[PDB]
Structures are given as structure tokens and as C-alpha cells.
Amino acid sequence: SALSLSLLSISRSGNTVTLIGDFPDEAAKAALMTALNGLLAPGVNVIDQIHVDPVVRSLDFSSAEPVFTASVPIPDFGLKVERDTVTLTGTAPSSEHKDAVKRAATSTWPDMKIVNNIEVTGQAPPGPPASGPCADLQSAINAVTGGPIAFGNDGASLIPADYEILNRVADKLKACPDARVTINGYTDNTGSEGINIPLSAQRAKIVADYLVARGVAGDHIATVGLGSVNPIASNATPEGRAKNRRVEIVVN
């Protein structure tokens, strides 16, 4: 019961949904409401800036509703409509999810041109379907860092002199706050001769400022400087200061 569609642009990012375009009437809007009910509404913001014009055209959502449902559990999803032109873009962690959506798009409206522009955020291999988040990342992060940072007593296992790994961890660290993060600072204490406590405290602040600059939510970041305690080594030689000078990052 159609032949052409109007220019519609819809972009979804995180928990924000921006709808802008035109509708052939109010009856068509009802169909959209059904596809929206699935989307969400609560802590999620939903705006519909669609104008009603008794001249424009729209694609029927008869067998398209099921398609939106498959893409409902996928963020960064977007859809561009332009008459005989249909382009859908978005980021899909699990390739398996895209496979199902890809078929849905083709099944949605085969009588039209469809272009799948989905990129993998680094995930695809048949793994735990859940957008490889910062889950147990703490265990995996240890591998990415594969370097000394806290409690290290390895005779001599691997001696990499790089820093690129730090930038990599920061990227993953920015989405790690999903849980709780605790930052501890190790240092000695003697008063004046040690003055390690003041430096350890201020030092932690520098770390937070850097991580936060990468997009790390400092609203869940906690720092605690425990000096004097757990006196790994004594304070007397240059090695003593470095021995106690330690830091650790833990995310729940």
C-alpha cells in the first residue's frame, strides 16, 4: 500500500532518543507508538519532533515492528530514510546480534535499497552476549598492563618498555565506573624525613585528574592514602622510598 517514503532521520545514543521527520497523518503515528513502547521511556529521554503533513509518505510498520524489537537491545542505533533510500548505522558489539538485525532489515522492506553500516567496537567472536563490558575487566586488565604497579616479586618475567598499554587501559577504564572504583596509595612515614604522606596524597589527585580527563567518571572514584601502614620496606635508602611508592586501581 505504498511506493515512496519521506525523509526521516532517527539517531539513538546511550539513553537519548532523538526523533525528527514528518508523518503522513496521525494514524501512522499510532504505529510508531507501538515501536516506541518497546524502546523505553523511564530514565530514558524520548522526544518526537515529527511534523504532520497530508502529503508526505511513510513506510508501513506491519512487519517492521519486529525489526525494531531486535534492535531495541542495541545502543548507538540509527536509521536514515530517504524515499527509495534506506540507511541504518550503529555500533554492534556482538556480531551475532547484527546477524539477526541484518536479516530483519532485509525482511523489513525487501522492496527497497538497504545499506548496513555497522562497525564492531572490538567485539564479534561468539562470546558472552552482553556487549563485552568492564565485567571482570580487573582480571583481564592485569594482562593488558602486564607490568609492575603493586605487589610485584617476579625475578625477571618480561621487561616491556612501552606506554601504549596505558592509553589502551584508559579507554576501557572510562566505561569501568559502571561499578565502584577504589584507589589506594602505598607509602612510608617518618615526618619530614619521610614526607611521603603528603606526596602520596597529592599524587593520587594527579591520577584522578588524568583518568577523569579520559572520560573517567570521578563521581565513583575513591582515593585513600595509607602511609606508614604495610611498611613493605624500611625508609632509609632511595630503594625504600620506591619500594613503598605504590599505587593500585580496582573496579567493582
Pair 181, 250: CB distance under 8 Å: yes
Phi first, then psi: what are they for 191, rounded to 5°? 80, 105
Residue 96 grid cell? 551475532
In whole angstroms, what is the distance from residue 48 CA to residue 23 CA? 11
Tell me the CATH number for domain 1-126. 3.40.1520.20
Place of cell 580527563: 213
Domain boundaries, the chain: 1-126, 127-252
Q: How many CB atoms lie within 10 A of CB 13?
A: 13
Report the structure determination method: NMR
- CA distances (Å), origin 22, targets 26, 29, 86, 109, 140: 11, 10, 16, 19, 47
Pair 227, 203: CB distance under 8 Å: no
105 burial class (0-12, 13-18, 19+ CB within 10 angstroms)? buried
The closest alpha carbon to 130, from 177, 183, 93, 82, belongs to 93
Q: How many CB atoms lie within 10 A of CB 184?
A: 18
**Does domain 127-252 sit in CATH 3.30.1330.60?**
yes
Distance from the Cα of residue 241 to its chain's centroid = 38
Q: Could you tell me the sign of the dihedral formed by the alpha carbons of 127, 129, 134, 135, in that order? A: negative
